[PDB]
Swiss-Prot record, chains B, C, E, F:
Gene Ontology CC terms, in alphabetical order: cytosol; GroEL-GroES complex
Name of one Pfam family that matches: Cpn10
Record bears the keyword Chaperone: yes
Xref: CDD domains: cpn10 (cd00320)
A biological-process GO annotation: virion assembly
Name used for this protein in its record: Co-chaperonin GroES
Listed transmembrane segments: none
Organism the protein comes from: Escherichia coli (strain K12)
Subcellular location: Cytoplasm
Regulation: Activity of the GroEL-GroES chaperonin complex requires Mg-ATP.
Protein encoded by which gene: groES
From Swiss-Prot, chain D:
PTM: Phosphorylated reversibly during heat shock. Can be UMPylated on a tyrosine residue by SelO/YdiU, probably under stress conditions.
Protein name, entry field: Chaperonin GroEL
Assembly notes: Forms a cylinder of 14 subunits composed of two heptameric rings stacked back-to-back. Interacts with the co-chaperonin GroES. Can form asymmetrical complexes, composed of one GroEL and one GroES, and symmetrical complexes, formed between one GroEL and two GroES oligomers. The asymmetrical complex is the functional unit. It was suggested that the symmetric heterooligomer may represent a transient intermediate in the chaperonin protein folding cycle.
Entire protein: shown range: 177 to 263 of 548
Task of the protein: Together with its co-chaperonin GroES, plays an essential role in assisting protein folding. The GroEL-GroES system forms a nano-cage that allows encapsulation of the non-native substrate proteins and provides a physical environment optimized to promote and accelerate protein folding, probably by preventing aggregation and by entropically destabilizing folding intermediates. Also plays a role in coupling between replication of the F plasmid and cell division of the cell.
Similarity-based family: Belongs to the chaperonin (HSP60) family.
Lineage: Bacteria, Pseudomonadati, Pseudomonadota, Gammaproteobacteria, Enterobacterales
Domain notes: Each subunit is composed of an apical domain that binds non-folded proteins and GroES, an intermediate domain and an equatorial domain that binds ATP and is involved in inter-ring interactions. Forms a large central channel that appears to traverse the entire length of the cylinder with no obstruction. The central channel of GroEL functions as two cavities, one in each ring, that are separated from each other by the crystallographically disordered 23-amino-acid C-terminal segments of the seven subunits. The entry and exit of polypeptide seem to be restricted to the apical end of each ring. Modulating the volume of the GroEL central cavity affects folding speed in accordance with confinement theory. Small proteins fold more rapidly as the size of the cage is gradually reduced to a point where restriction in space slows folding dramatically. For larger proteins, either expanding or reducing cage volume decelerate folding. A stepwise reduction in cage size results in a gradual loss of cell viability.
Disulfide feature: none
UniProt-annotated location(s): Cytoplasm
């Protein structure tokens, strides 16, 4: 329950996995009247660490540009090194991308990222869990129906993840 | 025209700044990539080292280039064109393979 | 193709990054091991030092290598392949024993 | 004796040597439903000092990998240098 | 086998780490003594300095050694054996007295 | 025995540590005086510099010495005797006057 200034009570039910983080760049918006970025059929990268080297991440990015499905980047710390390059690619229609900051902080963010990976049929792609990030293949990412992102809000509709794996993680969490 | 090329020196354009289709695919933002590649615009003709007849310079004008950016490389805007002045020895390849 | 190999220089691949079965056994994490070993891809043909006829370079293209990583060694991505450009003298062995 | 929130008293007896320290990495868990790492027939290294060089410790580690019994490392200070390599 | 020995270089084992009976008597703890002594495992055959016929290297393979540890000395684990690669000139003695 | 003396090098004892009758008279405390004087124990035989026949070393073994302590001078305990290894050129006198 939260204070609502409307004098009548209203109930809102969020659908699916929503984390309270917003687009890093206003330029990312592909639907200006909505004020939100809608990516239909996205792949999803759930990244480890701080990543301000498009410089290094490139061959993964090239493969996505050839593939032609939009992409979401979830990650911890991002310069204009990525965002202006992303604007150069997105706003002039070469590639279709958007990017958000990872929720909360710490190992709680890591535990949460694994839940997203299981849901999206994807992977926590991480040096510290044993992958060079730039080695990732297009199958190593997750996928889902459709995403919408605001300046406060991230919503993710309906994952590729295996249902028994998701139920297993829900049960493993229940433990 | 400048004024003479200097002895043992070369004058090159830098080949490009940003080959902008990275991997042939992505349109790069600020790589800030100053190509180590170049194009020879002039040659110093000879090296007079060791008190001997002017040794001919290793190659010749009008080939492209690959140079080591260095203190010896000097940025000069001869006329309206940015050109780089260095010793012929500051080059690291043309085309070898 | 680049543009010419430079005089007295060599072009090599680095032999590997991480021979990943450490001791033949354990699968290493981040060793970050850049092999000092290499493979010769091109040779500079001759050295013109001492105002004398081009001294032949010490060996020849198409052998593997062992080089000293140094400021003289230069990282250049010729084409799509990372290659290293240095003087032939920056090498510390091929195969001796 | 310790406070137990269950309104009935319960007694738990620990068996053998137990020290109150936990796995450095969640990735180490080999039994996820248990949430615990069970090593059957382990060798045990009781190490001195701070050890963030798998870099140096390797030939011991190779011998264990050939032997094929699991191993426990008890030690004072450990980087991802070990833990990611271990993962 | 490595790949060739380099020109003017030598390959040596380090003779020992800790001759552990200090004075012949006490069993030393951590001296951390890396012997400046060594054993020659390979030789570079010749020196081509001064634009002249390959000067023979000063001695030959299969004698023990005494070397100056230096930046020129390079630690390389050729095969499974730690070996040191340096110029023949970085050595400070074999056996003289 | 060591293993060979090195080319152009010399092996010397340091002549003394503290000539303990200072002025011939007072018994000095800690002067800490390492004598720049020495005694030649071995010689490198020849210098091969300038691509020429081994130039003979300037003098010969079995004279005392006066040397410049320097980075080139190296402290090695050959056998049980502390000895110093340097180039013959690091010496500043024998006996001249």
């Amino acid at each position: 329950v939260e204070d609502g200034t409307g004098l009548q009570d209203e109930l809102d039910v969020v659908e699916g996995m929503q984390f309270d983080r917003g687009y890093l760049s206003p330029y990312f918006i592909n639907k200006p009247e909505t004020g939100a970025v809608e990516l239909e059929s996205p792949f999803i990268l759930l990244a480890d660490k701080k990543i301000s080297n498009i410089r290094e991440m490139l061959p993964v990015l090239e493969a996505v540009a050839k593939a032609g499905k939009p992409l979401l980047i979830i990650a911890e710390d991002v310069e204009g090194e990525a965002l202006a390059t992303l604007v150069v690619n997105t706003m002039r229609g070469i590639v279709k991308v958007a990017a958000v900051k990872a929720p909360g902080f710490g190992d709680r963010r890591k535990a949460m990222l694994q839940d997203i990976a299981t849901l999206t049929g994807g992977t926590v792609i991480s040096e510290e869990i044993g992958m060079e990030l730039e080695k990732a293949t297009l199958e190593d990412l997750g996928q889902a129906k459709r995403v919408v992102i605001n300046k406060d809000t991230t919503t993710i509709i309906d994952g590729v993840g295996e249902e028994a794996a998701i139920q297993g993680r829900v049960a493993q969490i229940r433990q | 025209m400048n004024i003479r090329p200097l002895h043992d020196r070369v004058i090159v354009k830098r080949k490009e700044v940003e080959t902008k289709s990275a991997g042939g695919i992505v349109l790069t933002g600020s790589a800030a990539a100053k190509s180590t590649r170049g194009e020879v615009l002039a040659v110093g003709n000879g090296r007079i080292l060791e008190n001997g007849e002017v040794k001919p310079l290793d190659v010749k004008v009008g080939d492209i280039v690959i140079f080591n950016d260095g203190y010896g490389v000097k940025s000069e805007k001869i006329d309206n064109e940015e050109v780089l002045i260095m010793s012929e020895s500051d080059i690291l390849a043309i085309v070898e393979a």
